[PDB]
Structures are given as C-alpha cells and as structure tokens.
Give the backbone structure.
Amino acid sequence: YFKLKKLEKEYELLTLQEDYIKDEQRHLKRELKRAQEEVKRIQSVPLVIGQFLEPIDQNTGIVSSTTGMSYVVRILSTLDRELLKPSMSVALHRHSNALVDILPPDSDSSISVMGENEKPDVTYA
Amino acid sequence: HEKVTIAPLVLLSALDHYERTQTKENKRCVGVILGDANSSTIRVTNSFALPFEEDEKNSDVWFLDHNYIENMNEMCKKINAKEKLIGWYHSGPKLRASDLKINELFKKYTQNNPLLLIVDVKQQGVGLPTDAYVAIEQEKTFLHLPCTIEAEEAEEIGVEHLLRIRLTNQLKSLKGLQSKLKDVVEYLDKVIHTILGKLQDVFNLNNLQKALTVKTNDELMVIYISNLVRSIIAFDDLIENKIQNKKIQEQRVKD
Amino acid sequence: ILDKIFYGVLDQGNGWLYVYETPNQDATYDSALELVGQLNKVVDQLFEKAS
Amino acid sequence: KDELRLLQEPGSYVGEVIKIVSDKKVLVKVQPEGKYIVDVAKDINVKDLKASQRVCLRSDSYMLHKVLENKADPLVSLMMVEKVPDSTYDMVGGLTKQIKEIKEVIELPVKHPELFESLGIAQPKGVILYGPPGTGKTLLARAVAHHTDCKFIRVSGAELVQKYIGEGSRMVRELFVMAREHAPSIIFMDEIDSIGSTRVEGSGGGDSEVQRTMLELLNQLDGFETSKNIKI
Amino acid sequence: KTIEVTAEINCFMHLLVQLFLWDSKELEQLVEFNRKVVIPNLLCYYNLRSLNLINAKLWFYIYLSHETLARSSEEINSDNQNIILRSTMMKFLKIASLKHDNETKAMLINLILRDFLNNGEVDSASDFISKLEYPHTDVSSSLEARYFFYLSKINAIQLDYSTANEYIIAAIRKAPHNSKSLGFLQQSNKLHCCIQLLMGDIPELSFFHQSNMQKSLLPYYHLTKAVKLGDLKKFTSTITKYKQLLLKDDTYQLCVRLRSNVIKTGIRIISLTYKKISLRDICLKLNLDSEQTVEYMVSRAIRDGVIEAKINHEDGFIETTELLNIYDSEDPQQVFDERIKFANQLHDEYLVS
Amino acid sequence: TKETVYISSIALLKMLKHGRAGVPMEVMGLMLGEFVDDYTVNVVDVFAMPQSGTGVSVEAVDDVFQAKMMDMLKQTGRDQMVVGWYHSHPGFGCWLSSVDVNTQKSFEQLNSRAVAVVVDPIQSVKGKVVIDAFRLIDTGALINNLEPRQTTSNTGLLNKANIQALIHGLNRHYYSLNIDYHKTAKETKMLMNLHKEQWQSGLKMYDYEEKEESNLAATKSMVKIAEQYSKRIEEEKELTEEELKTRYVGRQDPKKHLSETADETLENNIVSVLTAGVNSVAIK
C-alpha cells in the first residue's frame, strides 16, 4: 500500500504541470509575435541593391553589390530552390549585409534608356 | 484646424523636473516648449524647466525670471535652428487662477498664438496624461487641440528596445456616459444652456440605423462566407497533419 | 434582353414592366470556386498519403 | 531567435589564395579590391590552402573566415554557360562535304586523341569557317557542343572590355580561369565572324585594348599550359 | 491463477471457432456444456490484461441458431439457457467498475437490443441507451459499424430519423472487411435507405447500384416510383411480391409508415406553386386517392413540416406556399448559427491531430 | 564590481537629438549625477554644447559658456556632479573619432572614473541600440575590484568582438562597456500603455471602423487571390514526387508551402472576425 500511495502523489504533481504547459504556450506566442515583428522591421525603407550570383548553402549566398564591391550574404529561410532564381537582381540590407528580396526584372538604367509606351492614343486604320 | 504633436522626449523631460526638485502638491513646475507653430502641425522638439515659485495664498503672486527665458532660448539655437518660442508648459492636475494671469507673459515675444500644455505626473483616469490648449481672446477662450505623439525613426525604435483591446475599449466607452451624466447634473444646480448645447449636439447626432439594419445583416453574411472558406482551409491541415503524424509513428515501430 | 443589350423583364398577364438593375452579381462565389477545386483534389490526396 | 543573431554580420569579401606564408598568414587577392595579406582561420590549417583556391575573407577584420566551394563565379554578359543544348546534325543535314571536314577536326581528337599522338602530328585546336552568309550554320552551332557532350560557351570580346579602371582586364582573365576547370568544352569566338551567322565584318578599331590581353591568353593557353580538349 | 486460466482459454477459443458455423456438436448437450465452462470465474476479479479472452465476438451468431427450430422449435416460451444467459449478461455489466471496459460493454447490449428486434418490446430499450452511451476506445473497426447499426434501427421504430442519421453515416464508412462489405453492408445500406423513406427524399440509384447486388435494388426501385408518383396501387403490389424480403429484415412495417409517406412525398412532386388550388383539381391529381381525402390530407401535412398552406372552405380552394423568400434581416441569420454548428463537429480535429 | 552605466529615459533621447544635425558633423555634452562604485551608476541630466570650428578637442569645450550655463543648474534643481563628457561622432572601425585624442587624457586628471559616451549608429540605426564609449587606463587602475567579470568579458576567441576592429586594445585596454537601463515606477508605467503602434487609443471603436470598412470591399477581392495560389502550389507539390525519398534537395519541402497556406489563412480570417465584432456593436 506504500507504493500505491506514492504513485498517487506522482500524478498530483503532473496535474499542475498540465495547466502550466498551456501557460507557456500562450506566453511563447507573445514572444514569438515579437520575433516576427523584428523580422518585418529589418528590411523597411532602407535597402541596398545587389546582383545575386550563385547559391551555396542554406542561409548563405554570394552576391555582388552595386557599390563596386562583392560580399557574401545570408539568404533568407523563405528562398531555397523553387523560389530562388539562379541569377537575378535582388535587394540587400545595408549594414547587416543580408539577402532581402528579389527585385523585379528591371532592365532599364540611366545610360542607354529604353522607352516604353503606356496607353497609346493612336487609333488603328 | 491645428494639431499638437508632443514628442516622447518632451513628455519624459517634464516628468524628470518634478521628482528632482521634490515638488509637492503645493507647487507646479513650469517650463517652455520649443518648436514650430507656423504650419498647422505643431511639433515640440525641446523642453526645459524654469525656477518657478507658486503661492496658494495669492493667485497673482508668481516668481518667473525673464532673463533665463531669453538666454536659454538663445543658447539652445546652436543645436537646432527650428526651435523657437511657441508657448510654455506647466505641471499640476488642475488649472487654478494663477494660470490665467501668467498667460500674457510669453505673448510679448511670441508671434503666433501661444500653446499651453498641462503635464500630469499621476495620470488619473482615461488617457492623455498631457493636455494641450490654446490661449486666444475675442474674455479668455481656450480650445483643446487634438493631441498626438510622433517622433523620429531612432526615437520611436529606441523605446521598443527599452520595453523588451476589445475589453478596454468597452470600459472607457461606458465611463464616457457616466462622466457626462455628472457634468450635466452639477451644471444644472450650478445655474439655478450654452454649455449643454454643445453636448446636446453630439448626443443627438436601432434608432437611426433601422433603414440600414436590413442591409447590414446582408453584409455580415458575406463576411461569414469568407470566414467559412478560410475555416475549411484550416480544417484540411488538421487532417493532413494527423496523417503526417502517423508517418512518424510508422517509422518508430519498424526502427 | 436575352442578348444582354437591354436590362429588364416584362409582364404578360397585366401588360406591365419590371425593373432590373445592370449588375446581377458582386464578387463572392468566385472564392467558392477555389474551395471546390481544393476539396476535390487535396482531400483525395490525403488518402494517397495514408494508404 | 538563433537565426536573428546569425543574420547580423559586418560582411565578408571574396578572394583567392595565392601563396602560403610561414608567418601563419596568407596572400589573397580580393577581386573588387586587390591583393591583401590576411590571417588564416584558426580552425583551418595552412596546408589545405592551394593556388587559386576560392575562399572567404571577412570585411571587418580582413582575414580568412571559412573555405567555400572552389569555383570562379562568372560575371555574366552573353557568356553564361547554358544547359541541355537542343540541336541535331539531321536538321542542318544534307551537306556531305562540310560534315566530313567538321568531324575530322573537332570531333576526331575528342573521341580518339591517341590518333594524333601516334601519327606524330599535333591535333588541331582551332578552325575558321568559310562560306557565303546565311547557310544555316546558326543551328549547327548548338550541336557542336551537344553531340560532343561539351560545355556550351559563347564569348563576346566587346562586352568584356570597358573604359573603366580595371574593368577591361579582369573580365578577360575570368574566361581563362573557368576554361581550365571546364576544359572539356568548346569556346566560341564571336564578333570577328564574317561567315554570316552573326556577321559584323569583324572589329579592328574596337579591339585595340583587348589585343594586349586576349591574344596573350589564347596563345599562352596552348603553348604554356598544354591543355588539350579545348577548342578555340 | 491468471496465466493458468488464460492458458486454458487459449485452447477453448480454438474450439469456439469450430462451434461457430463449423461444427455444432449436439443441439442439446452443447448449449448446456458451454455454460458450465464460462461462469466459474473466467472473468475473475479483473486483475490484469483481461479483455478479448472471453466469448464476445464469437457468440453473436451462435445462440440465435439454437433458439430457432433447434432446442425450442416453438415448444416452450423461451430458452432456459438464454434466460440464464440474460442473467449472466446483465450481471457482467452490474459488476463492471466502468474503468477499462470499452469493447466488452457495447457487445453485450447488442444481444438485448437484437432480441427486442425480433420478439420483444423496444420501449424498454430506450432506458438502456442512457447506460449504453460511453466513449469506448477499444471497439474494433469491425464492431464500430455494428454499434452504430443498432442505435440507428431503434430510433427508426421510435419515429425519429434525425438522431439515427448521425449514426448510420459512420456505419457504412467503417468495417472494410469483405464479409462486412457484402452481407453486413447490404443489410446496412437498406437501413440507410430506410431513413430516406421516412424523410421523403428517396434519391436515385448511383453509388448503391454497384455497391450491392440486384436483390436489394429491385424493391427499392419499385418503392422509389411508388412513393414519388403517389400511387397506392403500385405500392400495395410491391409489398405482396417482396413480402419474403420484408419479413427477414423487419421492414414489413413500411406498409403503414412508408404508406403515409407516399402521400407526403407526392405533395412536393406535384406542382402546388399557384396560390388558390380548387377542390376539383386536387381530386383529379394523385389518381382517385386524393378525391376522398382533401381537407384532412393537407391539414396534417402542414403541421408535420412538409408544406405550408391555407384552406378556404367558402369558395372551395386552398391557398398554398412553396417556401420561397429573400434574405434581408432574420432570414439569412437562421442558417448562420447552423453553419457554425456544422463546423463544431470539425472543431474536435484539433485534439485529434 | 565595475561601473555599469544605467541610461535613464531622457538620457537616451537627448543624445539622438543633440547629434541630429548632419551625418558627418559632431557635437558633445556633459553627463551629470552622483554615484558610487559597486553598483550605483546614474546620469541625471544631459545637455549639449555649441559646435565650434575645431571639432572635438581640448579647445572644443567653452568654459565661458559652461560657467554661464552651470549657474542655471542650481536654481532649477538640475545641479549635479559632472561624471563625464558624452560626444557624438560618425564613427570608424577603430578610434571612432580621429580628431578626439587629448580630451579623455585631460579628463582623467580631474576624475579617473569619468567616462565618455558616443552614439554609434548615426544613420546605421538597427534597434538593438548599440552605443559606444571609451575610457583610458594607461598605468594604474589595477589592484582594485573585478572589471571584466561583470558582463561577457574575458574574450578574444579568434579576433571577433563588437566591431572586430579592436581585438585587445580597442581604443585603450578594453574598458568593456556595459549598457543597461533602470527607471522608476512612474516612468515604466508610461511607455507600456503609451507606446503601442500609433495613437488611436482610449476608444478603438469608430477610429479605424470607417477606414477598415471602406477598404473591406477591396480586401474581400484581394484575399481571394491569395487562396487561388494556395492549392496550386500543393497540387504541383504531390504531382511531381512518386518517390518519397530525397534526390530533390527538398530537405523541408512541405512545411514552407504548408505554412504559406496556413499562416496566411490564419492571418486573413482573424482580421475579418475580431474586427467584425467591433465593426458594428451598435445595439441601440
């Protein structure tokens, strides 16, 4: 009977443990939300343009900045294979020097401009 | 109209002069706001206190040195040239008779309409620990301008590093009718219509929504249509994860 | 009217006319098309993973 | 949370190991900058450093960090190496004399290199096509690097030369680096082609800067390097 | 003594396979011999690892053969072995502590419910339902469909098709075994269609055509056109020819309940859409059976929830409504709480996953 | 222990306001307060100085402007002991101010425990709030309490610390700055309730009600496109894999696209429900 009474006390301590796990579950989501808000504030309006060259490893990449230099950045966890382009113009962080976003296929520049018509008013025939 | 923008640097600066001077309820710390009142957006980028002395026995007795007013405003020009005299701020929860007599002092060196600010260290009730008012005459007529807080990029982010909904909205909304009811009853016995006319304008403007009640329920159903579809998407992941959880259990039995 | 030129419906019994507004629908059910296509594919894919 | 701390980095340049120093340092040439003597990583011995080995140098402390994969990252103008070339000799077929001359020159040493060494004559490393313009040679160009299972490479001498400082040299030398690792490949020389596929009638006034470099690398590749299976 | 009793039962369960549909020994001495090998403390005190070792799944189809034309042959009121069996059956549940009992609790109730289906009163079976309901986690997938089969059949005699609807849905989806998909599924599909007989829908044959043989397709096809078209003459001839199939399945009661549904279903088939329906037009429709019953026929169908109409005896017409409206305020909000209730059954997937 | 600088609420905000003019330019200031080693370190009030033509040097500070200002500290209760001189510089890899050399060596003569503070980011702002300082040591300062053991000192694994232009010496001797903050009960009560996102507060009902409801018609159309691209990814995901092995460098393939169909769905439905509860709440 001594061993049977000891087993009863073991599950009594687990009773408070079950309700305490739910306390950390709702509290961690508050800290997880703060971690997600920190990721969104990294990019912001401050971003530098660079040229992606070749992928190496997850959270690793080799790019070429538009400042004349070349650096090794860390690719985001979102871009891996299907969403990652082999060579395209991409966005980079300034001081932290990390991958940001894949820029749209902009072939225009200041030298040797290419005009593009928008909503032409010329009627056929 | 115009709006008052109080930077967090100014709100926290006025709270420091209260504790360091050991100011009790018998004294109120007075200070000078600095900013640009020319445009419609009034922003205060600087604040400083002054050696003010308050006397409760006579509301017409106040000690203020005009030499420190002009000197400090001139010496702080080296920091930023956008800081001029737009008004002044003072402490204390309430406006006494001594506050009305000191309003005409800074008006000599102030071009546009001066701005008044009341700093409350206790912050008892509702929001807005700092209330802003404008001093203009036709009898002194004070108007409450909307109080907003906007800072620079590094100033707003620096607050988040130091600190590292529906129920509250309903509580303050219910207290709005309780506080308004006491203002009408006390004013009723005080006279025995102009002040109550402004409150009647807001109070008057399924009573008037009966015509839109039919169209409201039709829009609420369309909102539930989107919620019903998104709920099914979340339900498919539960069955997908349940099957995925078995694949892990199948590997534990063989291995 | 059946050609979507004029919008309205007539009355043969009393010889009257009725009002018909130009738009017949907003955009709602277009989201249900994405739901029907999902429940006819992903649901069938769940059994392929289990079996 | 552990990823956020890793995303903060001062940055790291890109360079190649030149030599080994007995002082526990290394001479690495930074491509955007130049040759800088830096420190070898403490977890990486100095014996693993080879010539023209691609490594990673930190920006902040200017020293070796880790050892990445060894490759030369191409700066891409017209020179990007493609994959899965699509062509055949049956599409441009019907010419008996031309096919016999192409096989005995390009394809012959690739399949059987021992025929030239046993006979005593050097295998041809290059050929110049002759004929009227627009004979259909544009389609068979893809089949040259296809049936031979080589790397498809096109070279534009104009886009590799720029008036900017240092931009008219490093681009040309980049072709020589990858040509050794990609050696089972056939290099295509354009902009001089009068054959009519792409016919500019050559350029004698725009090549004055590149003649001091490209002509030296093409001649030194055959003579000094003695690297076979490379068709210019 | 748990191992010693279990070792003897291991040799007993092997014999019970022969006693089930294979080798019946004698129809007299065996039923008395099988009783004395069980009672003497085989279930004991519920010590450890006690389940599935009793008779349980084996004896369902055994004792029903000894009661019919074997030991009794209608020479007595009830089998004395079954009377003692009912004493041992109800004693097993009385001594149960409701701790680890899951599968063994639902199997014994299957006997007292099945007995009331042939000879007995099903009114007392409703009191056992309150005791029968437990979250049984040990019931195998083969018996989960049978546990839902009896619960749906009792509600059919109780004139409730709404409660029996949720049980019969999960019954046809379970029991993948071949023997359960042939004899048990065809008998369960006819009961699933019996729920549609009381509802008034009676859908056509699509999935049920290739799922079962032509034995169950013939009576359902004739009852489909008889109830839809509202013809009592064709409905009567179907009961006579198919009477042999109706008695074994205890579906013979459709001569009253389903016969009343022949008129109720035919109401929605014919077009009442117009408002004032003259008495002569009602007498012509539905052959001559609607001529004798006019005002009383519509009066009960409205309260039962079929249609909504109004009868006028002054001018001799009946004002009818087809139940058609437009969502404005309270109309769309009726299904708002229902669609939320429909998702409540899917809200339990969070704990399952 | 050592001296761990505790930045107050106003001490951090004024440093960004004093160096507000120009990226390349530079200002200075005076830290105040009184404190004792082994814990207490505090800065009561901070104030800037006018920018001179010499930049930051021993002649940069104006004793005339300092004496005229110091007399104003007493009457306002602002008078405290000077604990150091804080500056602002664009910053370098090592020796963030090239014009600042002989200042701190003249500062340590009056008080050896005085420090100097410089705001590092100056347009590099991140949100970890990395701030830099310097303090001279030279001969002495030893035979005392434990400076390094306080916070994450005794370092030099590889060369990596801080900016990694420093290693051992930093400026001089690796003073090992420690930046913390402490506030009173009144200051902590403010920024918690005051600072959230923007100010709609005190009534949330009608402020964003009309703005969100007006765009709800366009939001209903935009959330439909997000669902359209949801199942199309999962459809092509299971169509191309007949193996269930990895040749696909797919180490985690599903969870990324599964979360894109979940978290986005979890984001779009909650904003159409929790906001819908207060979107009417009309009653009478």
